[PDB]
Design a protein around this motif. Structure first.
Motif, PDB file in Angstrom:
ATOM      1  N   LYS A  14       0.839  -1.186   0.000  1.00 50.28           N
ATOM      2  CA  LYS A  14       0.000   0.000   0.000  1.00 50.28           C
ATOM      3  C   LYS A  14       0.878   1.240   0.000  1.00 50.28           C
ATOM      4  O   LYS A  14       1.872   1.300   0.726  1.00 50.28           O
TER       5      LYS A  14
ATOM      6  N   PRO B   9       2.414 -17.101   5.756  1.00 51.42           N
ATOM      7  CA  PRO B   9       3.236 -15.917   5.996  1.00 51.42           C
ATOM      8  C   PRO B   9       2.518 -14.657   5.552  1.00 51.42           C
ATOM      9  O   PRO B   9       1.615 -14.688   4.718  1.00 51.42           O
ATOM     10  N   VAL B  10       2.915 -13.539   6.142  1.00 49.50           N
ATOM     11  CA  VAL B  10       2.276 -12.252   5.905  1.00 49.50           C
ATOM     12  C   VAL B  10       3.354 -11.230   5.584  1.00 49.50           C
ATOM     13  O   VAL B  10       4.347 -11.121   6.308  1.00 49.50           O
ATOM     14  N   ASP B  11       3.161 -10.491   4.497  1.00 51.46           N
ATOM     15  CA  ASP B  11       4.025  -9.382   4.132  1.00 51.46           C
ATOM     16  C   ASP B  11       3.191  -8.121   4.017  1.00 51.46           C
ATOM     17  O   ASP B  11       2.031  -8.166   3.605  1.00 51.46           O
ATOM     18  N   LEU B  12       3.776  -6.993   4.397  1.00 52.00           N
ATOM     19  CA  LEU B  12       3.008  -5.755   4.449  1.00 52.00           C
ATOM     20  C   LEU B  12       3.979  -4.585   4.328  1.00 52.00           C
ATOM     21  O   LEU B  12       4.648  -4.233   5.300  1.00 52.00           O
ATOM     22  N   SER B  13       4.032  -3.995   3.137  1.00 52.34           N
ATOM     23  CA  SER B  13       4.850  -2.824   2.857  1.00 52.34           C
ATOM     24  C   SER B  13       3.930  -1.623   2.731  1.00 52.34           C
ATOM     25  O   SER B  13       3.294  -1.432   1.693  1.00 52.34           O
ATOM     26  N   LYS B  14       3.858  -0.813   3.776  1.00 52.01           N
ATOM     27  CA  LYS B  14       3.038   0.387   3.763  1.00 52.01           C
ATOM     28  C   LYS B  14       3.938   1.611   3.749  1.00 52.01           C
ATOM     29  O   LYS B  14       4.933   1.663   4.474  1.00 52.01           O
ATOM     30  N   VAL B  15       3.601   2.578   2.903  1.00 49.93           N
ATOM     31  CA  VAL B  15       4.193   3.908   2.923  1.00 49.93           C
ATOM     32  C   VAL B  15       3.065   4.900   3.148  1.00 49.93           C
ATOM     33  O   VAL B  15       2.012   4.792   2.514  1.00 49.93           O
ATOM     34  N   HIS B  27      11.241  -4.314  -0.047  1.00 49.83           N
ATOM     35  CA  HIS B  27      10.805  -5.433   0.772  1.00 49.83           C
ATOM     36  C   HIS B  27      11.292  -6.736   0.156  1.00 49.83           C
ATOM     37  O   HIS B  27      10.917  -7.071  -0.968  1.00 49.83           O
TER      38      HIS B  27
ATOM     39  N   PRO C   9       5.141 -16.679   9.716  1.00 50.81           N
ATOM     40  CA  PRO C   9       5.982 -15.507   9.944  1.00 50.81           C
ATOM     41  C   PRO C   9       5.285 -14.240   9.486  1.00 50.81           C
ATOM     42  O   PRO C   9       4.383 -14.264   8.652  1.00 50.81           O
TER      43      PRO C   9
END
Lengths: 59, 59, 59, 59, 59, 59
Positions: A14, B9-15, B27, C9
């Motif tokens: 996001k 698994p969970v990835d979360l790239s927030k800006v 990431h 993870p």
């Protein structure tokens, strides 16, 4: 007598730019090679031999 | 008598850029090779031999 | 008689730039090779031999 | 300025049964997931901002 | 300025049964996940900001 | 300015049964996960800021 492979990864890139701002993202910009296997092998061969009489000489 | 592989698994790239700001992210920009296997092997061979009489000489 | 592999993870790269600011992130920018296996082996062979009589000479 | 990946594995399952004999083999009867990669990443972005004047108030 | 990955493993399962004999083999009857990578990353971003004047108040 | 990874393992399961004999082998009947990597990272970012004048108040 039962297998189960739940493969539920989550990705979420996001960007939320407010007044006069900016910003980018590079989410996993690479490689990978995914295997999700549930294999089952079963070896039950029958390698048998009934000769009866064996007379080897080999001079 | 039961297997289970939950792969979550969970990835979360927030800006979140506010007034007149910025900022990027990289990431996991690399590699990987994911295997999620549930294998089962079972070896039950029968390698047998009934000769009866064996007379080897080998001069 | 039961296995279970929960692989959960969590990754979280957040940037929050306020007024006129900035800042980047490099989240695990490297490598890896993930294996999540639940294997089971079972060896029950039968390697048998009933000769009866054995007369080796080997001059 | 040069990479090279020589991938030259060798497998060899030989059986040589002589007079009235026998014998089997189970050569790597399992799994695997082979990756032979030569990747190259190059990140040269330009994330820039020339505002000139910034008057934030946020009552 | 040069990489090289020679991957030359050798496997050899030989059985040699003579007069009236036998015998089996189980060569690496399991698992594995082989990665042979030569990666190269290069990060040269330019995250810059020329504001000029900044008057934040935030009552 | 030079890397080299020679990966040359050797496995050798030999059985030699003579007159009226036998015998098996279980060579590494297990697991493993082999990585042969030659990675190179290089981080040369430029995170800069020329403001000019900064008047924060934050009542």
């Amino acid at each position: 007598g039962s297998v189960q492979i739940v493969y539920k990864p989550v990705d979420l890139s996001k960007v939320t730019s407010k007044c006069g701002s900016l910003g980018n993202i590079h989410h996993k910009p690479g490689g990978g090679q995914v295997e999700v296997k549930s294999e089952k092998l079963d070896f039950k061969d029958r390698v048998q031999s009934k000769i009866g009489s064996l007379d080897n000489i080999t001079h």
